Scaffold this active site. Structure first.
Site, PDB file in Angstrom:
ATOM      1  N   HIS A  41      37.433  45.448  39.933  1.00  0.00           N
ATOM      2  CA  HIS A  41      38.010  45.104  41.063  1.00  0.00           C
ATOM      3  C   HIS A  41      38.456  46.321  41.908  1.00  0.00           C
ATOM      4  O   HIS A  41      39.021  46.162  43.135  1.00  0.00           O
ATOM      5  CB  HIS A  41      39.425  44.184  41.073  1.00  0.00           C
ATOM      6  CG  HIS A  41      40.299  44.566  40.188  1.00  0.00           C
ATOM      7  ND1 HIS A  41      41.268  45.694  40.453  1.00  0.00           N
ATOM      8  CD2 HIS A  41      40.926  44.232  38.994  1.00  0.00           C
ATOM      9  CE1 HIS A  41      42.110  45.751  39.495  1.00  0.00           C
ATOM     10  NE2 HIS A  41      42.045  44.835  38.554  1.00  0.00           N
ATOM     11  N   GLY A 143      48.751  49.408  40.182  1.00  0.00           N
ATOM     12  CA  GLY A 143      48.479  50.705  39.788  1.00  0.00           C
ATOM     13  C   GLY A 143      48.147  50.948  38.385  1.00  0.00           C
ATOM     14  O   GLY A 143      47.615  52.128  37.999  1.00  0.00           O
ATOM     15  N   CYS A 145      46.829  49.126  36.392  1.00  0.00           N
ATOM     16  CA  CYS A 145      45.254  48.431  36.089  1.00  0.00           C
ATOM     17  C   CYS A 145      44.369  49.573  35.570  1.00  0.00           C
ATOM     18  O   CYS A 145      44.523  50.696  36.040  1.00  0.00           O
ATOM     19  CB  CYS A 145      44.601  47.633  37.155  1.00  0.00           C
ATOM     20  SG  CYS A 145      45.330  46.220  37.666  1.00  0.00           S
TER      21      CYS A 145
HETATM   22  C1  LIG Z   1      48.314  45.055  42.273  1.00  0.00           C
HETATM   23  C2  LIG Z   1      49.429  44.036  41.889  1.00  0.00           C
HETATM   24  C3  LIG Z   1      48.743  42.792  41.459  1.00  0.00           C
HETATM   25  C4  LIG Z   1      49.880  41.841  41.172  1.00  0.00           C
HETATM   26  N1  LIG Z   1      51.115  42.242  40.726  1.00  0.00           N
HETATM   27  C5  LIG Z   1      51.974  41.151  40.353  1.00  0.00           C
HETATM   28  C6  LIG Z   1      51.707  39.860  40.345  1.00  0.00           C
HETATM   29  C7  LIG Z   1      50.010  39.710  40.531  1.00  0.00           C
HETATM   30  N2  LIG Z   1      49.455  40.483  40.578  1.00  0.00           N
HETATM   31  N3  LIG Z   1      47.718  42.400  41.515  1.00  0.00           N
HETATM   32  C8  LIG Z   1      46.685  43.447  41.783  1.00  0.00           C
HETATM   33  C9  LIG Z   1      45.378  43.321  41.965  1.00  0.00           C
HETATM   34  C10 LIG Z   1      44.435  42.193  41.738  1.00  0.00           C
HETATM   35  C11 LIG Z   1      43.567  41.667  42.630  1.00  0.00           C
HETATM   36  C12 LIG Z   1      42.918  40.288  42.405  1.00  0.00           C
HETATM   37  C13 LIG Z   1      42.102  40.452  41.055  1.00  0.00           C
HETATM   38  F1  LIG Z   1      40.927  41.355  41.302  1.00  0.00           F
HETATM   39  F2  LIG Z   1      41.619  39.324  40.803  1.00  0.00           F
HETATM   40  C14 LIG Z   1      42.905  41.109  40.092  1.00  0.00           C
HETATM   41  C15 LIG Z   1      43.589  42.406  40.220  1.00  0.00           C
HETATM   42  C16 LIG Z   1      44.900  44.719  42.178  1.00  0.00           C
HETATM   43  N4  LIG Z   1      46.003  45.521  42.492  1.00  0.00           N
HETATM   44  N5  LIG Z   1      47.144  44.902  42.093  1.00  0.00           N
END
Ligand code: A1AUY
Length: 298
Positions: A41, A143, A145
């Protein structure tokens, strides 16, 4: 004596943590040999997150679009490959500090160490237990991830997890190093329902064995419940299926208490501890495996 959640030392994994940037998105990666593993992602913008078409997104991506940093050292991406929900970038530089490593897939109840990282910098480590829901209860902000979970097996680092999603408050999941998510989860910004979670019965049995060796055995009685009978009861009482193991047999030999004695104790504990604690807890402490407690017992 004492029982705590112990993390594996981090020295073998710290020199592999990198930062991966594509566009405005920065997350963490794992640099092993000349490969950089990171969540796929990293290539999708905030507008393309509800249902990303990753194969179409990969057409607009060039190796030069990736900025990979090991602190300030910039790695040059030669090529990239999408493996499930993970990107595998090939870089010109081999990580001279790559440990002896393998990839593994943890099962519910199994524990591992997460090396939390932000902007490619390790912040610390914590112990996690893979839930029956194929999630972990970690601590991850946006961040984090790409932070990795690992277990040390002999002199080998077994990488088992790459952080990807937060399914709800304090509820996290990621992929193994084949790029496959744990559970039926997907890298899509949509509400995802959790797989059924259970109390990890063999982990709670490990907690009870550890308690017997930590001067706590009030729950031990003359009643016994077979594995077969416990497993039927477990179905309707929120407990996972029990299987005996060589470590449980060792714990039974160290305490002189059979698994069946503790399975009967679990059934009684289900209707209340009556204000009595087992090593400072009145809960079904199911976060440590038989092997985890065995390493802290003598
Ligand atoms: C940063 C933070 C989050 C997040 N924080 C708290 C609750 C839920 N999500 N998500 C993400 C993503 C996310 C984007 C959609 C995906 F690709 F499907 C999965 C990752 C990216 N950066 N954050």
């Amino acid at each position: 004596s004492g029982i705590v959640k112990m993390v594996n030392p981090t020295s073998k994994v710290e020199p592999c943590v990198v930062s991966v940037t594509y566009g405005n998105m920065t997350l963490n990666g794992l640099w092993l040999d000349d490969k950089v593993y990171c969540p796929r992602h990293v290539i999708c913008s905030a507008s393309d997150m509800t249902n990303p078409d990753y194969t179409n997104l990969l057409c607009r991506v060039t190796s030069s679009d990736f900025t990979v940093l090991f602190d300030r050292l910039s790695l040059t991406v030669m090529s990239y490959q999408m493996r499930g929900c993970m990107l595998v970038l090939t870089v010109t530089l081999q990580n001279s500090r790559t440990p002896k490593y393998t990839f593994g897939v943890v099962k519910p109840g199994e524990t591992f160490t997460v090396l939390a990282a932000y902007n490619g910098k390790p912040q610390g480590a914590f112990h996690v237990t893979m839930r029956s829901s194929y999630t972990i209860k970690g601590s991850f902000l946006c961040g984090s991830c790409g932070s990795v979970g690992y277990v040390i097996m002999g002199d080998c680092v077994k990488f088992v997890y790459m952080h990807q999603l937060e399914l709800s408050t304090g509820c996290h999941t990621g992929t193994d190093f084949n790029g496959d998510f744990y559970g039926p989860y997907k890298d899509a910004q949509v509400v995802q329902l959790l797989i059924q979670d259970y109390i990890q019965s063999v982990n709670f049995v490990a907690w009870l064995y550890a308690a017997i060796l930590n001067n706590c055995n009030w729950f031990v009685q003359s009643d016994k419940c077979s594995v077969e009978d416990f497993n039927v009861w477990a179905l309707s009482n929120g407990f996972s299926q029990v299987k005996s193991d060589l470590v449980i047999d060792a714990l039974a030999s160290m305490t002189g208490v059979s698994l069946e004695t503790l399975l009967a104790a679990i059934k009684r504990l289900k209707n209340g501890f009556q204000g009595r604690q087992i090593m400072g807890s009145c809960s079904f402490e199911d976060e440590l495996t038989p092997s985890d407690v065995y390493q802290q017992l003598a």
